[PDB]
């Protein structure tokens, strides 16, 4: 923000050479404070009265402590402070007089002072003893009770040891003082008057100039950001909504740092957090069964699907069970089902959560059974005492949506093979994305290759050569046997995360099984809150799909980290046919970028398949062929625009030579648009293209010479028969 | 196995440059059809493909002749997407353009010291329309075009 505002460069170098001398006499930091305080200074010409663009009613004369004395005679002022939200200093100058009896400029000082006062040390950080114990110098510390140069009608009260007891009742007054110690410590004339009369205010002001000013100007600066930031609960306040097991999260905290790369996780079910710290394995790609959120089984992947969230969905369960069955049918020996065994803690946990209610006991076939209660009205559950297994049955007076009725059976859950032993399954750590530092990717490339590349003689080839390298070793993502789809580093990262939550004590395998959701091109999901662990090791969690996007733009995108976003964004994800939006820079600049040959023909093809009617039919009509012949003409111009030999020219020419090529195209379009009958679906597209071209050519023009409006420049063209001289015209048209 | 949509295009463009309106295109025509689609086979590489099926006036290729020959250099490539992400990277600020500023920038983290001189240089030789910056389009050209 530029602080000074000189509004009418009316006088020669005098009004100027005066505002300057004025300002330069003020400390470069006092301004900094003013600036950070969102302040602005107005040095307008001759604008005395309630006349400046900012001098009409806002937060003016309400009460009267005004100048070095309270006087309050407005029409006579030449300096003023808009005092509330953002400070607004306004000064004006007429002819040469501020230096003889600077007893005047001293107001441009206090008038200024009334900015820092209630927002300086006096109160900004609170009167910290620094300013309090300085005010104690009323008359009891130093042998200098010489404070009339700042304290008359509000401090002839020497008969008060001024301390916390009363200093507040008169902040507006203990400011008028800070406004003189300032007006005096800097006034172009009287400065020692402050070092003589009061020995403290001086040293105070003086130590303020020694750096006290750079202080507040830095506690306001740092808070400059922390103040206006992106609302994202950090610390464990997030680690809670996260879902991750705090031990693991902390474990991750290392890698993020060592490797220097952000880590983002989608929500990890609460109902599965401890099932993890516990030792329960996590769901991979091998299982597409649904979890559950209620009853004993909650947090597990019940082989029985009517015991998972989709409780009732006669088809989500119908086709639901069909999934576990396959999960086991295909990936046998690795995936299967095992009896549910709610341990101790878990029980006491599903407790307050209200998932279950442990109550009355019972006896069957000789074994003890504490009965596990759940409000579900179709299944009854009981846990075993010898082994604490869990069982259920379709109540004596009810049925199962699929049409099943069974007596006390064991609750099987899904379990993958870990170290040769089926372990129950629960939610895994789904990475939303991984943002490694651009420089860490550099370390990915093999010294020699990247070497053999920079040596290249051709400059533009070097670039290409590099970009690929960066694509080759950092952006490319190949599929994979198990870990889904991910990049090589993405994999290495995957291990360092797992072996990291392994040395913590987890005994159930990995917790991050597949690649990053930014590759979930098939069935992309859109989670609101995303847990992130920056390279510094600070937990964070967003609240919006927007905030996330906004966060990633500020920190990951615009900050030297490699990040790419789900290829299905802004498109229509096939699988779940979902439309999930993500700001795409490229598409931003589309609005004013002339289409390409191929981008053009592409769009034609699309519409053809949409209205089963093409820009031109395969007929005998000779006006049809005209249309064909004519699009082929645009498909040319557009193709001509993007010519690689455009380098053997100069930026000047480039624009021109292209502003024409572009114009050419704009024509044939305007041409066809006025042809025979062309389906309106196309009529519109061509309409769209026009604006692009227009927009583009405008850009090329304002970039170089400003007045020429596209519409006008067009008019002045002769596209009848000869194009030749028309181009020579175009040139002259631009002068 | 080109997607149907990926098929509509090849025909929407193959037939746009089929002047005599039948369904077979001349050599020079095949070169044209392709370029428009954003591809440019060498003056000699353009034959080996058309020369791989001499069942015409030993000179043209039908709709299928073409539709099928778009695998040899097609069925295996999916780079158009990576390159677009490469671009997104350099475009540090999200304006949709790549300023020489940011070129040199990302250029260094990847460990390369570029001379303030040899950058405004690349940016220039990469800017086709002369607005001093490179957009996805020109970027695409610089990258792919060999
Ligand atoms: Ca033909
Ligand atoms: Ca940019
Ligand atoms: Ca450009
Ligand atoms: Mg998963």
PDB file of C-alpha atoms and ligand atoms in Angstrom, chain B residues 97 126-135 138, ligand 3:
ATOM      1  CA  UNK B  97       0.033 -17.628 -18.801  1.00  0.00           C
ATOM      2  CA  UNK B 126       7.905 -19.788 -27.421  1.00  0.00           C
ATOM      3  CA  UNK B 127       5.548 -16.899 -27.848  1.00  0.00           C
ATOM      4  CA  UNK B 128       3.890 -17.212 -31.221  1.00  0.00           C
ATOM      5  CA  UNK B 129       1.302 -14.434 -31.015  1.00  0.00           C
ATOM      6  CA  UNK B 130       3.810 -11.948 -29.610  1.00  0.00           C
ATOM      7  CA  UNK B 131       2.166 -10.938 -26.326  1.00  0.00           C
ATOM      8  CA  UNK B 132       5.416 -11.650 -24.487  1.00  0.00           C
ATOM      9  CA  UNK B 133       3.933 -14.583 -22.531  1.00  0.00           C
ATOM     10  CA  UNK B 134       3.259 -18.247 -23.314  1.00  0.00           C
ATOM     11  CA  UNK B 135      -0.288 -19.708 -22.930  1.00  0.00           C
ATOM     12  CA  UNK B 138       1.811 -22.081 -27.487  1.00  0.00           C
TER      13      UNK B 138
HETATM   14 CA1  LIG C   3       1.494 -15.389 -25.836  1.00  0.00          CA
END
